Amino acid sequence: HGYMYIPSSRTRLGHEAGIDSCPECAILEPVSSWPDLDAAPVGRSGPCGYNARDSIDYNQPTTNWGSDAVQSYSPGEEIEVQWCVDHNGDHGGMFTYRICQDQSIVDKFLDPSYLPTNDEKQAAEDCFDAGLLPCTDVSGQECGYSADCTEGEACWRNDWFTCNGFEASDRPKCQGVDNAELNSCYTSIAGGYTVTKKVKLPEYTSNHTLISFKWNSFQTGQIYLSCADIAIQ
Numbered sequence: 001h002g003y004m005y006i007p008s009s010r011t012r013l014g015h016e017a018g019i020d021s022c023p024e025c026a027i028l029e030p031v032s033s034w035p036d037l038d039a040a041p042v043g044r045s046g047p048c049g050y051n052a053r054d055s056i057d058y059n060q061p062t063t064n065w066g067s068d069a070v071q072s073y074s075p076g077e078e079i080e081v082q083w084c085v086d087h088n089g090d091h092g093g094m095f096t097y098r099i100c101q102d103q104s105i106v107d108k109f110l111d112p113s114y115l116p117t118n119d120e121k122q123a124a125e126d127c128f129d130a131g132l133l134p135c136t137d138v139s140g141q142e143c144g145y146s147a148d149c150t151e152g153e154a155c156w157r158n159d160w161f162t163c164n165g166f167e168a169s170d171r172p173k174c175q176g177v178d179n180a181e182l183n184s185c186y187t188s189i190a191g192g193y194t195v196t197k198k199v200k201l202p203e204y205t206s207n208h209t210l211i212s213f214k215w216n217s218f219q220t221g222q223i224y225l226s227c228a229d230i231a232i233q
């Protein structure tokens with residue numbers, strides 16, 4: 001259980017409006033999340049997530065989210081990105097942030113009077129995967145391989161970030177990455193822990209586009225998707 005925290009995602013904004021119960025409960029499941037990280041189709045979840053506990057489709061804006069950028073950045077700027085993992089929901093695995101460099105695809109997700117179709121949700125996903133923000137594009141950032149993967153498997157990739165080993169002796173799982181304190185970010189079930197990295201924004205402008213976060217579970221056949229509305233100008 002987890003969701004994108006910084007920049008503030010649609011999921012975080014919905015929680016701030018008080019119209020949800022469980023921001024960390026937005027899940028693409030049951031699916032094959034491992035070791036092939038991109039195989040599972042996103043279905044209703046899309047690039048922004050659907051929260052089936054609270055019946056909220058983050059892919060469609062409201063006045064609370066998706067109708068404006070939450071933060072404006074410059075092309076190529078290195079930025080902090082952070083997600084929140086639930087104390088009782090630390091599944092380990094790998095995660096990534098993506099920007100779809102096709103404004104016309106993204107625009108389907110920016111209209112509060114429009115619900116993107118399942119077809120549009122998957123085409124957006126494929127556009128996001130072409131627009132993955134690699135860990136390796138930030139000079140000085142350590143981009144390791146997963147202790148739960150071996151060379152030769154589809155999880156052997158350091159464009160994605162990795163959580164620490166699920167059975168790691170020291171600082172296991174996702175919480176191990178920042179090793180922060182409990183309630184360093186909000187989750188509803190058992191309190192949250194931050195998971196923090198940097199990415200380099202593409203050399204690309206948009207007055208309103210999306211960063212899509214995807215966390216692929218190691219322990220469970222589950223994917224967690226969120227998105228944040230940004231500008232790159």
Ligand SMILES: [Zn+2]
Binds near residue numbers: 001002090
């Ligand atoms: Zn979970």
Ligand SMILES: [Zn+2]
Binds near residue numbers: 021
């Ligand atoms: Zn809430």
Ligand SMILES: [Zn+2]
Binds near residue numbers: 037126
């Ligand atoms: Zn994908």
Ligand SMILES: [Zn+2]
Binds near residue numbers: 036038
């Ligand atoms: Zn694949």
Ligand SMILES: [Zn+2]
Binds near residue numbers: 087
């Ligand atoms: Zn504990």
Ligand SMILES: [Zn+2]
Binds near residue numbers: 102104105
């Ligand atoms: Zn286009």
